[PDB]
Amino acid sequence: LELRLKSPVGAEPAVYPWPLPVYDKHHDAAHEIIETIRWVCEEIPDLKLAMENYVLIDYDTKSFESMQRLCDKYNRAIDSIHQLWKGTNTRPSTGLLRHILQQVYNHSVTDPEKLEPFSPEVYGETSFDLVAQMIDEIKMTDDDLFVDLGSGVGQVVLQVAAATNCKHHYGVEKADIPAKYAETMDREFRKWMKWYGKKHAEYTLERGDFLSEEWRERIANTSVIFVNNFAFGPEVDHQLKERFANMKEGGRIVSSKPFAPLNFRINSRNLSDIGTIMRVVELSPLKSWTGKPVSYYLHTIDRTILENYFSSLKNP
Ligand SMILES: CNc1ccnc(Nc2ccc3cc(C)n(-c4cc(-c5c(C)ccn(C)c5=O)cnc4Cl)c3c2)n1
Ligand SMILES: [K+]
């Protein structure tokens, strides 16, 4: 009939129907169950001690009785640990977070006929580790407001919210299918994070056009913008540079293609270019990274670039 996994923190149990749902070509719900148990065991050393060793070695993913036995062994072990704590919320580790995001996606994007080499289906394979590097480089604080422009199903927002302490994390998506899927991703993320007893910052996944009037002031008041501008046309890029021109000093933009040349040299013929008000650096996880040789671009609002040019004109 069904398989149930009791929460290590006493939240509502995770309930899976039998036959288990089929996921994409290289994922199945039976492995998700086993890896969930394994992650909770890393999380609680007492749980690994109490749980019967063999259970996580000798199993049949295609057998209801075998999967039920595995779940029952884990559930009984959770009960023993909960009894031990009678007699007497942190951020997830990077590894647990990759598992949680995968789990959230699988429960949200059922039959992925809807929605490329960098698709939501493969987020965990290169984008996750790269976003983890961007998070470590940026070092956001409680004073920061974070926005992912074109958030898709919301994977980057969820990862940043689980990793940082920004006052708020926003994801804005214009397309109908991804935005609709983001609503389930949001529900599933909140539910699973509660199940593991893991903390995350506040976040909102919204449907909208980041080039709208409403979003002009919102971009101007964001301290950290993430934007996958890789496929942006010249008009989106031009409009986006105009939005960025209203940002505060020290405002940061992390993107897949630079918005200004890395070697921008202010002169009399380029005073209208975004390069006059922003520093740009190419960051690469390769410079102990073993993934794809991929770069990201960090832009920092700095109007002193423009101020020095005028100062140099007046005081040669
Ligand atoms: C990627 N998924 C999502 C989903 C929702 N939001 C974001 N936001 C976001 C914001 C800032 C950056 C900067 C980079 C480097 N990436 C980045 C780029 C690419 C990529 C490459 C290198 C080449 C071609 N294409 C088409 C690509 O997508 C792959 N993965 C990442 Cl993590 C970003 C992603 N990304
Ligand atoms: K044991």
Provide the experimental method for this PDB entry: X-ray
CATH architecture of residue range(s) 1-118: Orthogonal Bundle (1.10)
Alpha-carbon distance of 299 to 143, in angstroms, equals: 19
Alpha-carbon distance of 156 to 246, in angstroms, equals: 24
Alpha-carbon distance of 86 to 97, in angstroms, equals: 28
- Evaluate whether 18 touches 3 at the Cβ level (below 8 Å): yes
CA nearest to 296, candidates 170, 166, 129 = 129
Q: What stretches of the chain adopt beta strand conformation (E)?
A: 2-5, 14-17, 145-149, 168-173, 203-207, 224-227, 252-255, 278-283, 296-301
Q: Is 35 exposed, middle or buried (0-12, 13-18, 19+ CB in 10 A)?
A: middle
Residue nearest to atom 18 of ligand 1 (CA): 256
Please provide the DSSP assignment of 136-169 as one string: HHH---TT-EEEEET-TTSHHHHHHHHH---SEE
Resolution (A): 2.4
Maximal CA-CA distance, the chain? 83
22: number of Cβ within 10 Å: 11
Hey, what are 137's tokens?
């480089």
For β-strands 2-5 and 296-301, DSSP reports them as: unpaired
Binding-site residues sit at 123-126, 146-155, 173, 209-210
Q: Which residue has the tokens 């209203």?
A: 246
Going by C-beta distance under 8 Å and a sequence separation of 6 or more, which residues neighbour residue 306?
266, 271, 276, 277
Alpha-carbon distance of 19 to 21, in angstroms, equals: 7
Residue nearest to atom 21 of ligand 1 (CA): 256
Ligand nearest 158 Cα, by number? 1
Q: Give the long-range contacts of residues 27-33, CB within 8 A, separation 24 or more.
A: 27/102, 27/106, 28/61, 29/106, 30/61, 30/62, 30/67, 31/61, 32/102, 32/103, 32/106, 33/3, 33/5, 33/67, 33/70, 33/71
For β-strands 224-227 and 145-149, DSSP reports them as: parallel
DSSP 8-state secondary structure symbol assigned to residue 116: -
> What fold does the segment set 128-316 form as a domain?
Rossmann fold (3.40.50)
CA distances (Å), 37 to each of 4, 30, 54, 89, in order? Answer: 11, 11, 13, 18
Alpha-carbon distance of 168 to 201, in angstroms, equals: 7
Torsion of Cα atoms, 33 then 36 then 38 then 43, to 10°: -160
Type of residue found at 13: P
232: number of Cβ within 10 Å: 19
Atom of ligand 1 at shortest range from CA of 128: 32
Alpha-carbon distance of 221 to 166, in angstroms, equals: 13
Q: Which residue has the tokens 């005028």?
A: 310
86: number of Cβ within 10 Å: 7
What Rg, from alpha-carbon coordinates, does the chain have? 23
Task: Count CA within 13 A, CB hemisphere, residue 7.
Answer: 14
Residue nearest to atom 28 of ligand 1 (CA): 118
- Evaluate whether 70 touches 59 at the Cβ level (below 8 Å): yes
Where the chain is discontinuous (C–N > 2.5 Å), the residues before each break are 88, 115, 287
Nearest 5°: the CA angle 142, 169, 254 is 90
Strands of the sheet containing 224-227, edge to edge, are 203-207, 168-173, 145-149, 224-227, 252-255, 296-301, 278-283
CA nearest to 159, candidates 96, 253, 230 = 96
**Helix (H, G, I), strand (E, B), or coil: what is residue 186?**
helix
Domain assignments of the chain as residue spans, ordered by start: 1-118, 128-316
Ligand 1 pocket list (CB less than 6 A): 118, 127, 130-131, 148, 151-152, 155-156, 226-228, 230-231, 254-256, 294, 296
Buried-exposed string 172-209: b where 16+ CB fall within 10 A, e elsewhere: bbeeeebbebbebbbebbeebbebbbbebbebebbbbe
Binding-site residues for S-adenosyl-L-methionine sit at 123-126, 146-155, 173, 209-210
Choice from 108, 228, 299 to test ligand 1 binding pocket (greatest atom count within 8 A of CB): 228
Alpha-carbon distance of 89 to 108, in angstroms, equals: 24
Choice from 210, 256, 295, 296 to test ligand 1 binding pocket (greatest atom count within 8 A of CB): 256
Same fold, 1-118 and 128-316: no
Q: Is 304 exposed, middle or buried (0-12, 13-18, 19+ CB in 10 A)?
A: exposed
- Evaluate whether 112 touches 278 at the Cβ level (below 8 Å): no
CA distances (Å), 210 to each of 123, 174, 216, 228, in order? Answer: 23, 8, 8, 13
Residue nearest to atom 14 of ligand 1 (CA): 256
- Evaluate whether 79 touches 6 at the Cβ level (below 8 Å): yes
Residue nearest to atom 33 of ligand 1 (CA): 228
The alpha carbon of residue 168 and the mean position of all alpha carbons in its chain are separated, in whole angstroms, by 14
Q: Which residue has the tokens 């480089």?
A: 137
User: What spacing in Å lies between the alpha carbon of 78 and ligand 2's midpoint?
Assistant: 13
Length of the chain: 316
Hey, what are 299's tokens?
């832009």
Type of residue found at 2: E
Residue nearest to atom 32 of ligand 1 (CA): 127
User: What spacing in Å lies between the alpha carbon of 42 and ligand 2's midpoint?
Assistant: 12
